[model samples]
Target: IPVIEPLFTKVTEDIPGAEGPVFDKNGDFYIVAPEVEVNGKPAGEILRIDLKTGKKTVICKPEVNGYGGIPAGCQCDRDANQLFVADMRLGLLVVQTDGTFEEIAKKDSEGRRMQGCNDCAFDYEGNLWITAPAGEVAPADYTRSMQEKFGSIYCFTTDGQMIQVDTAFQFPNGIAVRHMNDGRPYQLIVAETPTKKLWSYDIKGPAKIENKKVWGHIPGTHEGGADGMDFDEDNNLLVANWGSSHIEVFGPDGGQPKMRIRCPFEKPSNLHFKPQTKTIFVTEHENNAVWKFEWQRNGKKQYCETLKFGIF
Candidate 1:
């Protein structure tokens, strides 16, 4: 067998529970350090890393607003040039370039309150797909909540509607929308953390889906399962196998891993590919670091990067 260690360059470390990793249109990188303290109180911070110099800037400690943000995922709407955060305590938020932000949703369309938001992704139409791996409980009860199957998937439309599309998942952690050639959404992929199962749904329309099925599975011996993931241009799924400490690549058809990109840490939380390049940036919880490496294929272009604002 060939020695298959994936070469990775450490960008920065000591972040303390780094999770989401994303890039803006200008190529500046952003990630969430979810385990930070402000005057002895737990808080979450969004950091902007200069791509050229690798300088870390604290965009905002979102907990100051009183919702007690525990930001887990970071994404950008390229056209609007805004950053979206999936905050476990603050709910879904839209943060501007200057760090000013507003909480967008705490309840579904039907007015039922949602739990802590885990992660989010943008569909081709610019709608946001979110995963809620928690329920209505204190943030300190994460262990108790993760033990129950109270997870759900939600879709937030541009027209200001939040809909709960699916329920009963055993901690849905990561979400992405497979896009068609013309940038229309094709399918919805979600990772159920406890079960190690990747679920798929046929995308019908805005906040619409059908045909749920088991798309794939992550192989690991540790208690944690899949965390955050993304796709390459070739449609290969790049998943961060949390407790297993690496990124696992699954073919388009899905089954066993096609490649296991090894990492130096024990918990890689999430990853995102640099737009239009084969380089991928990853966030690891174990070492509280972000790493980057060249991938076999270019990263799939997110709709936010190509779509004109207000066209959808």
Candidate 2:
């Protein structure tokens, strides 16, 4: 195993409310902080950060119709020119460099409203997979009865077609794609918040979903928490334990976590790995910080560090 070292910490505090952090093809990072105080507290705003200088820019704010607020899941296109964001209150918003915006797909395939669209990702084929953690019903209606019917993942194509990948879940949150050795082309891994478990499904083909499995679980944790995830170069899974204040690194083999790196923030919500430098960038939700850690991996070993920064 390789030893890990702390790199940088709290690089995102200047952005005011940084949440989701994703790297584009050129290495620039983008994040969202709910601007609840702006625009009559409608939704939130989207902010962009330059990795080299740590400069901040507000690219888009929520419009009057609540079409672009509370931004969450954000991923840039392969070309790095366009960004797709899942707005918790505004549906799905397409952001461009020119500052123009478009509402892509809000509801499910059947045109039913999505309760709370949380996280999303684009597969190698360009199909956009999104998670409606709370479904189309409002949380005020949250009951055992409501959860039994609404939690699901939605697949939206570039052509504007939406399909709901219905699987049993309670508070389905962050999602990622990985190709397992089971001969399945692509599998969808979702973090079930309420259960503190990671669930996955192999998409056999266009409309076929198979091999549903509980890949990993964090027992005795908080009720509804785990956040974002990413796959390392060796295919190991790294998850942000929102309620646990650490990032759990899981090997490709099974449910055991190889290492857990505690963060400076109260809630570490998302993570992205820079393959070239072998660095992991994490978003700290509660303390408004962004952290960077250098990981060393050798054989089946891993080590992590809590980067240096003034105490939050």
Candidate 3:
């Protein structure tokens, strides 16, 4: 039960659709703001904001097939000086240091069109992992895929190789990897928005995701479960409960819900952790807001601190 302090809100900057945040080594973080308009044009841009000054810099303007392309997730490989982005319209793209982008994958291995690319993460290796809802845009697959897991998880390589990891999700949105106590090896945790559950896919080697198990239930399932997520130094899972407008922090087990941090925005879409710091940055995609906070983990927890409640 750490103290969730307010950092900054979207009102601080007149931008909307803030999702997919990643921190640079310099401490500045980038958030994807749908450049839907810039005096009326197909802008769809990524904004880099200083953690201390709150300054805004347009990193890159993403171009879809046409105007009004929506950008969802962004994961950085500073080692390669590139950022991998997932756009609802553009599929997967690599944004370069010069602000130029290279198209990665618009179609799957079978060459089928990608519907809605959500979020991404990197394995220990240089390969990138991604998530996509069953169809294009928000809430599209929630209905048809909720009962059946048609959504997919992907593993993409820089050399243009794409492989399907999992094809079962109500709406697999946010994705991140961490070492869970599975008694075997590490696993990837996927945030399912409609199903209100976090799933664990134990990694076999590099591109293998088997033994799909429910990490546990998340908050606000019927309307929203979890979207964008990240891990802390303590291995706690901090998930954005967009349906309930809350930030749910779960223990390392990925199940037991321990504390809930209330969010000011209606739908907090994504989050990122500053390197070597307890500071956190969040984005509200719909309300056009970016928020931040510095929280404390179980070490100085304020609540019961011993037993983990809300395990379901």
Candidate 4:
């Protein structure tokens, strides 16, 4: 899909530190503004953008925001009764449907603190997959042997089990999964910013995500590997360049670049699609802004139901 209107007016300039934005099944859209504080307290806030009128409303305030504890990524569960947010301070949190959410996971199985919780996605099975920048620093002497042992991807089952899925990342950011022909997911695709590459692993089960390989790594054409990711109706992946401006498009399961969307954002942090409307929404941090765009099939505009989080 191509962008017809590159500049969709900023929905809310008052949403300071707004980063991760997601849409629920009920047509309600939510984004995290981790910087705004109602008073002197660490008032981490989540803003709900009305789908019908493009209006903004403060939905929730917690102990964290973009600066502290850091609410970077967001995703609602299948029932829409709970919305999960990524907390750099606590690892992850669960927001209830009635405006109440709880800190679910902050550390791995060993009780070790997570370095930097960045982004996440949900598989078709209702399981949540997570990515982080922890262990992202170039290892000892900035060598491969140590870097490969750092940074990991995690899976949180419905039972609240925080399990490590894979390792070897230099800043793992956005993540998405391709629906498998079988009941389970086929593979997990992730973005590594520093390395400027897109990686994938064959997800066999909760305990296995193997055969890790680079799906796409383009630098001459576009740097900044990938920051956030979303899937189109045809399975094409749309990626945000965190280190630069523009969203690069890739084929369903190939490394070749299909299209590049020139954006005005200096640090386009994350993005997602409006399933029924074919509109794309982005959270740009450098300018402290959020953007919206319509997806064009070829020349004319069409509806886009790209399942960034395929509902369970």
Candidate 5:
């Protein structure tokens, strides 16, 4: 087992209720804290944080926000001006640096409302890929209509055109795109939440889905719900496990995890990597906190240290 340490912690009062945490090019972090009433109603505010100064600010508060959820998955285009957020209630959201937001796409390509648009990633061409887990839309209504509806991965252009890939997944959640060093193009990595598996797709063009392969699969021991994921400096995939209290780390070439560090909080969700420092930031939904880890590469195994813990 690898020894870890806790660096900084911010209580939930500071962030209100932190959900998804993503870092921008300037090293600033953004999180979604969709406020919910005691009876589970929507509060309609998204929170952003300055990691360097630990300052918190409200980026956007959508009107149609559903209770218990706001922006789930957040990713920024290369331009850094436009930020896209995946809303569990309202579908997809577009937030500008100037604090303007709009609902770009809400339904699947067939115009059916997506129960929960969870996490998303952006490709080099500026297309936004998102995960819509149908199972999470209604818990008590888990009838056959939901089981037969395997989760979907969608593609939305910056121009507002939405395309559904229709790929079959157990419970698709976190997604990311990593550009290869050979300059061949980028590869798609998606986390199958329920299945505890990571799937990769080689996307050549718009609306193209081919060569679906299993990049990595967690053993039965790590049967927690997989949520957010991001690539490290060496291109290794780091996954945040929702049920289990740990972050699983894998090599770039796709094999079993080389290391698994126990998380400081419960229900670790999405994560973002700081390339310059080789550090990682993770979101803990259940505890309403965000944790940080510093990774040290050693031969085939990697060592990690918990640097900071923040509550929102």
Candidate 6:
């Protein structure tokens, strides 16, 4: 019954629609707001948060098809010093810290239009996995999207391929790649929000997977289940239990949660580790804030921060 009593150190609050907490190779922290205002106009904006001073500055404002973009998840490709964004309205994009961006994928290899992107993760092989939780729907229509099972998973391979892994989910929110000791990816895990289940797949190769099944489950009856997650150096899965207001940790064996970390606010949406450190940063929808805390184990190193890509 280990508990993180004084759960976390508050970074900053009062941000609306706070999600996607990540860090670049240079160690700059960032978060995204899908719906924000720039001169009283609705748009999706990316902000860089200085962990030291808790200061935040707008870095990018993404747009989609002449309309404001809706950003859900972000990841930095330290190998290329580039940032990848999962834009709900526009699909996947590569955004620069200087506020410029390029469309990565608006349609899959099969030429099917992507619904809407949610979250993304890069494997040790530099393959980017993404989650699409909804179609092109208005913010107010998200509830309807959640009730449907059209969510899908996509992968952008290193050799330039946009592959649609699969579809049909009750909102596949967070995604991550689990790798072997030598940085070889072996498993792909995704969070199904409504089902409160962590789905797993055998990683055969870039955008190649099989044996889809429940890898783990989150405790609690809240509708807002697992939203985002990451792994520690020990390969323990640390997931943000959205409505449960806590972070749940599951070991490699993946049956029950080995530990539970309480959050200061409800609706913990997403989280990421600070490079190779044990410190973690979390974003909560309730407080519209980001929080940080030190962990017992060092965080797993992201592919973006690695020197060489893993052998496939």
lDDT of candidate 2?
Answer: 0.66
TM-score per candidate, chains pooled = 0.93, 0.82, 0.81, 0.80, 0.79, 0.93
Q: How far in Å is the alpha carbon of 50 misplaced in model 6? A: 1.9
TM-score of predicted structure 3: 0.81
Superior candidate under lDDT, 4 versus 5: 4
Taken over the whole model, the C-alpha lDDT of each candidate is 0.83, 0.66, 0.69, 0.68, 0.65, 0.84
Q: Taking the tens digit of each residue's C-alpha lDDT, what string does model 6 give over 78-130?
A: 56777898877777889887888888765679987766788999998889999
Give one digit per residue, the lDDT tens place, for model 2 in 1-312.
Answer: 232235555565744455667765556677887544554554566777777777778777855253336677787776346778876666577788555777775456677765556788666556677777654433223222124645677777657687887755677778877754432347778888767788888876553467888888763466446788877757778788886767777777548677777666567788776535677777776767677776664211111111123262
Candidate 6 versus the native: TM-score?
A: 0.93
Backbone clash count for every predicted candidate, in the order shown: 0, 4, 4, 4, 8, 0
Residue pairs with colliding backbones in model 4 are 34-65, 34-66, 96-100, 278-304
Model 2: lowest-lDDT 10 consecutive positions? 298-307
* Model 4: residues with Cα > 4 Å off, grouped in runs: 1-7, 35-43, 51-55, 64-68, 135-149, 181-183, 220-225, 297-312
Comparing 3 with 6 on lDDT, the higher-scoring candidate is 6
Scored by lDDT, the top model is 6
- Residue 117 lDDT (model 6): 86
List model 3 lDDT by residue over 88-206, tens digit each: 65667778756788777656776766656779877545567788774643323222255567788888865667877778677788887774333233778888778787888878766
Where does candidate 1 have its weakest 10-residue lDDT segment?
136-145
User: Which of candidates 3 and 4 reaches a greater lDDT?
Assistant: 3
Q: Output the TM-score of candidate 5.
A: 0.79
